[PDB]
Design a protein around this nucleic acid. Structure first.
Ligand SMILES: [Mg+2]
Ligand SMILES: [Mg+2]
Ligand SMILES: [Mg+2]
Ligand SMILES: [Mg+2]
Ligand SMILES: [Mg+2]
Ligand SMILES: [Mg+2]
Ligand SMILES: [Mg+2]
Ligand SMILES: [Mg+2]
Ligand SMILES: [Mg+2]
Ligand SMILES: [Mg+2]
Ligand SMILES: [O]
Ligand SMILES: [O]
Ligand SMILES: [O]
Ligand SMILES: [O]
Lengths: 44, 89, 275
RNA sequence: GUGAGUCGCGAAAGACGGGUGAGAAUCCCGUCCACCGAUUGACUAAGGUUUCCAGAGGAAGGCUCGUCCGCUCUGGGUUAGUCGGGUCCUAAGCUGAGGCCGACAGGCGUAGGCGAUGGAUAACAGGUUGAUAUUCCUGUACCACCUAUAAUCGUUUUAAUCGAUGGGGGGACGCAGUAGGAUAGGCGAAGCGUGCGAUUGGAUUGCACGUCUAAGCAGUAAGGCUGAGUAUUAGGCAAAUCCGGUACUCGUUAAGGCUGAGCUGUGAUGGGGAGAAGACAUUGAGUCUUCGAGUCGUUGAUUUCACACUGCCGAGAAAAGCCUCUAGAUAGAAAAUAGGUGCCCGUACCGCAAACCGACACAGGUAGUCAAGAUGAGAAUUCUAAGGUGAGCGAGCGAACUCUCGUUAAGGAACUCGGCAAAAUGACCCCGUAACUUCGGGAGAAGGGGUGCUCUUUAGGGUUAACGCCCAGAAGAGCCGCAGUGAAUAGGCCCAAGCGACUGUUUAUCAAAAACACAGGUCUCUGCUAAACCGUAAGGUGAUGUAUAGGGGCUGACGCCUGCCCGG
RNA sequence: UACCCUUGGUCAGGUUGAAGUUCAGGUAACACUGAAUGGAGGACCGAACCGACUUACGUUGAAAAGUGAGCGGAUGAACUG
């Protein structure tokens, strides 16, 4: 087998990273929930 | 200025061997080019060429009160000499 | 011509391919070339719209002057070359002025033969000139429908149109496909059939030789399951139940007309024979 | 809690001695033994994030114990003008001023811009720590740049001279195949160091070593120039001494004109390296100041060094650096000399694994580089170097039963749903080889034979001045054993039939097939922002396409054939 | 995981020996003949690599789909970073 999640940075500091989120409407809303809810981390 | 460019000295067995060829080891404030250290340490002691080499370190972990936390960042800079020498000990 | 390949194994038996006797060099002119990524039949978006393309081999864009725009100036022909993206083999052309431009090859062209682009360039093979001046009863390639665009007509392998006659404005022409159209009097064209004639006797021979091009497979409809295609489903094999054999997207194939009768050139269209 | 002190304790060869310690099958030390060795070895990328090293500790973790660890506690470790990357370029793709579109959101897209797995790019050898090395020092080198200094310029023209943001050249690319020139390492020797055996015997007799960079001067094995030179110019948006064209003198002369290039010689190197006890007051006399002393010749030879050459066709990124041309800048440089200036990131460790993904210290996967010796065609196989490991429970007994391996006389598929499995065949050479056939094959058909060591005689071929060094045949004559490709790795075959023509793919984790596709055939659509299509629309595919072209349906090589019915 | 794009990398060793070329043969000239050359194939054996055919094992497993013994393809419609 090779299981899912053969990991990497660039595809993870891309897509789920910030500047994608804060370069898109929906993502800005997402961040609004992860702030309103309180969290020690974003983009992860 | 010299003040916020030199934060600490460093001493150890490593530096002790280092002082054979007239080397030294300081820790700087971060976000400092290599060159400012040269002209500034020059400014403060009048010692010079034997240019600098330098590194960084990533911050480790530590548990002192069973709560997680990290050490502080550390940029270490290694100074070496050709012109007299300096002792401040 | 086409040289049969002696059968040595299963995947050569019916094989056949060209001889390449109308070629003088192999490596092209760097300059006129131009690069070309591929798409595999799909959009600006990324979705598949046309089916079964892609998989193939890499290639480039050899530029052509279909306009034959610069007129009067005699030219010569110092080389032939090969062109993957079209059936029709292709010629290089040293103009009088040192320029260099590639042109689709008419059958029966001689290296060192000279070919013109002008009004007063009297008739031969290759020469470029309008339709009004040409006589009737002649075969012509690479007509433009419109002044100054770059021709769209008879541009593929083999023979080409026939001029049946002309008014002053507009001008008739019969195609291969045998179908008729009124064309402007002033559209630029040329004379002589196109080059390669036996591009179609090629028995491609083996599955890969569609992939080498490339194209890729197409699966039937009476095999799939009934979502993906209407004919599909059915225990065992599948007679087409419904009348009017359908596309995957409804919309039959078999006899249905799809010319949209509001188009402006429908007056120019007379005597529709092939479609 | 019960189950249960029961199943399990996660493939594997360890043993002994001496220490330690409160206490040892498990810790350290050594000696022996065994294992891998196209690897359980060595080097880096992704990845993880301090696991790295020293000193202590053993509460829990470790599938046992544990005086130990990749666990805890304290302390400490990662050095670059030249290395991978950025201040250089670019495709796919992403974003995209103005702009076109959409109920809002937002969607499309030009200009430009970001984005490497690719292109260009200035460095090497040794030493060194418990832990870093092309980063430190030691020596020797290189690129850009500034400052200082002069041997050439002379309207700032043109000339020395800068030069594009524009014009040009090249950079610049496929796949397969054979042959060749070089070196890597290996090989066996008549040069060097040590040492002569206590088991019968032997003494040219045993063992190990046999190097040296990048850089700069010369040359250089093989290739290349549809060629060199002149004049002109209907063109390369403006210009052009450059390109491209066109006409001529010289051309096939190869004179070798020019180009690029393996690698070699020399210095670098009266130096580093080094088999070296023949070296001490000394360190555990191990050890270190210390002196020891060699670079020869042969044969073998790549899968490394030119997509170079030839052939084929399925017709094989881009841009920049780099070199030129002018428009233009501008008084008027700098040869070779000295001196200095040279940024950010990363660098520790594991990296076929105990540290990554896999919930575990898990018998899985995990791209890439190097990859020695005998045997062999070979990266196959068997045994070993280099080096690394002894697999984190073991001691007893040697019952059932299960599993894994080996054997079994007589018979030989009777078992059986079915010769499932197991066994037999198996390498090299030689003889020979039917039906049928789309003439290619079938065909390794089948069947059958030989193969060991010694001695003698002989063919030979490559390599050399020759010596000898290699390579692999024949003939005879002999010896042994049951057995001579003595072990290991390596095809079971024949006949007949249906289905399918192929080779290929498929139901990831119960089906790999007679299914799907396939080249071919056929019908219908489609006259070009063509039809079909995704979308609301712009827009874009189709398509750098233009009816010998593109889309849809059905059938499935071949060749013999493809009947009647148009009422529904 | 499935396709597709751009860009790279990989595939020991051996066997077979077409087209074409050329030497003679041979014709009025071509067909055609026999040699030598040349090295095509979704060609043949067969390790890497890939895959999963049969069987045994395991089946509160070593593993939430593998191992061992054998097996098919391996210059192409191949594989994969
Ligand atoms: Mg003991
Ligand atoms: Mg090119
Ligand atoms: Mg070539
Ligand atoms: Mg890292
Ligand atoms: Mg493992
Ligand atoms: Mg070997
Ligand atoms: Mg019998
Ligand atoms: Mg029987
Ligand atoms: Mg078809
Ligand atoms: Mg094979
Ligand atoms: O094979
Ligand atoms: O094979
Ligand atoms: O094979
Ligand atoms: O093969």
């Amino acid at each position: 087998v090779k299981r899912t999640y053969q990991p990497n940075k660039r595809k993870h500091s891309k897509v789920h990273g910030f500047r994608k989120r804060m370069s898109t409407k929906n993502g800005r809303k997402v961040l609004a929930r992860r702030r309103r809810k309180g969290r020690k981390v974003l983009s992860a | 200025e010299a003040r916020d460019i030199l934060k600490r000295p460093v001493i150890t067995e490593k530096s002790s061997e280092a002082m054979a060829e007239d080397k030294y080891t300081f820790d700087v404030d971060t976000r400092v080019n290599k060159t400012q250290v040269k002209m500034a340490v020059e400014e403060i002691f009048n010692v010079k060429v034997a240019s600098v080499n330098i590194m960084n370190y990533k911050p480790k972990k530590k548990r002192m009160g069973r709560y997680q936390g990290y050490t502080n960042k550390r940029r270490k800079a290694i100074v070496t000499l050709k012109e007299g020498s300096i002792d401040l000990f | 011509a086409i040289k049969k390949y002696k059968p040595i194994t299963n995947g050569r038996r019916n094989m056949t391919s060209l001889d390449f006797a109308e070629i003088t060099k192999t490596t092209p002119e760097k300059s006129l070339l131009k690069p070309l990524p591929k798409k595999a039949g799909r959009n600006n978006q990324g979705k598949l719209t046309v089916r079964h393309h892609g998989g193939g081999h890499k290639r480039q864009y050899r530029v052509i002057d279909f306009k034959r725009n610069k007129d009067g100036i005699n030219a010569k022909v110092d080389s032939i070359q090969y062109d993957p993206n079209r059936s029709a083999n292709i010629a290089l052309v040293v103009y009088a002025d040192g320029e260099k431009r590639y042109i689709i090859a008419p059958k029966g062209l001689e290296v060192g033969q000279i070919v013109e682009s002008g009004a007063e360039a009297d008739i031969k093979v290759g020469n470029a000139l309008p339709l009004q001046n040409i006589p009737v009863g002649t075969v012509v390639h690479n007509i433009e429908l419109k002044p100054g665009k770059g021709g769209q007509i008879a541009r593929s392998a083999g023979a080409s149109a026939q001029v049946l006659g002309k008014e002053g404005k507009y001008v008739l022409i019969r195609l291969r496909s045998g179908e008729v159209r009124m064309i402007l009097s002033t559209c630029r064209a040329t004379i002589g059939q196109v080059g390669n004639l036996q591009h179609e006797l090629v028995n491609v021979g083996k599955a890969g030789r569609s992939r080498w091009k490339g194209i890729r497979p197409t699966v039937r409809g009476s095999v799939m399951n009934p979502n993906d295609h209407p004919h599909g489903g059915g225990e065992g094999r599948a007679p087409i139940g419904r009348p009017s054999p359908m596309s995957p997207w409804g919309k039959p194939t078999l006899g249905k007309k799809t010319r949209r009768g509001k188009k402006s050139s429908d007056k120019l269209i007379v005597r529709g024979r092939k479609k």
